[PDB]
Amino acid sequence: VKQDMPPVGGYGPIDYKRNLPRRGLSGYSMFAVGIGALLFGYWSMMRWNRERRRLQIEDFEARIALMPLL
Amino acid sequence: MFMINVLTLIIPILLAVAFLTLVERKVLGYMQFRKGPNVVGPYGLLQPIADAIKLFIKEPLRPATSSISMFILAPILALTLALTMWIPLPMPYPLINMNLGVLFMLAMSSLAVYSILWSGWASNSKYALIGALRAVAQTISYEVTLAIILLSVLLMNGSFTLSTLIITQEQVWLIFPAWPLAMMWFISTLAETNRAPFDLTEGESELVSGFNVEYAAGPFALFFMAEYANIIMMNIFTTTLFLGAFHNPYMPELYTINFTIKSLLLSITFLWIRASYPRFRYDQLMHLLWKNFLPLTLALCMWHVSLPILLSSIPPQT
């Protein structure tokens, strides 16, 4: 006879359980990364803002020099 | 000559809106294990043309119980406000170089809500009224936090001018020292345009279509292009605010390419968010911004007003 049957040793394994691998970093790591990014941004902003203030002072004194003729 | 400039501003954004419909459909299909439109033309390049020609040869269907004057005025106001609020954006030179462009965009974003409100009220239907009141709730949820976020992030720029924002980010990006404000701003821009997961006005689950349920083809397309031009303008605004690119005065095409690809990535992130999240309830969105975002926004505003005084880093206003 010929029918639809499983083999002698059966079929392979079949999963039925929830699989969540829990990928990622701990909270301390991401918080430290954020704090370091904030500090780097603050330092770069302080340097560029001081330079921009000096440039603005230079332009203002240029206007001071040009004022009496106008 | 200024007519040439304004038409070359307003026609490519309409073409961008149509191809944004195409890109939205195709990308959203590909994130859902399927294909987008590819049968209309070569890789579906002619689908927005077919949609636009189809929608403008259909019946308008003005209802009998609706006040016709407001019913016509509301989509006109929506498309108009979506058009004359792209202007102050520097690309890298804005068409209109306003000294107070940030407040201008805030005011005209507050004004665009009235189109949704009058569309809901004008068409005499209960679902339209529900959509209009949900728009009101969304506006009172997001507006104050959005304005305080903008004020706190503009304390490092120096002034409200959008043209000087490139000079501020000439050294480093503005997302490095203001990334919590950047995240809160991104959520605020998501909730501003009634985009997912804060749709809540064109809700196809709780309602049928919301405020535009009585708007048939022709006027219905106006709200669609207004919404899509709005999301592109929010993406460009966020790119200018937090991702300022290198600008060469001799080669503006470098800045144009840079902020173009950055705004494209931001729109791709918008559609990425759209396909992956369930819809918020409109009372949970109300308690989201008023309880979680607002105290942190106030604390960050005090931090950003006490920071440049602390460090001798007060930016110039000229």
Ligand SMILES: CCCCCCCCCCCCCCCCCC(=O)OC[C@H](COP(=O)([O-])OCC[N+](C)(C)C)OC(=O)CCCCCCCCCCCCCCCCC
């Ligand atoms: C523009 C750049 C990119 C931005 C990100 C864009 C891509 C990512 C998008 C992700 C998907 C977003 C989909 C919409 C989500 C909507 C929900 C939502 O946002 O809820 C917000 C939720 C709200 O929480 P909730 O909704 O769960 O409410 C909890 C309510 N209780 C507690 C009562 C149960 O979170 C926030 O509001 C957080 C805002 C950002 C916080 C940033 C903190 C920065 C660090 C501060 C300092 C910390 C250290 C301690 C102090 C140290 C001092 C030195």
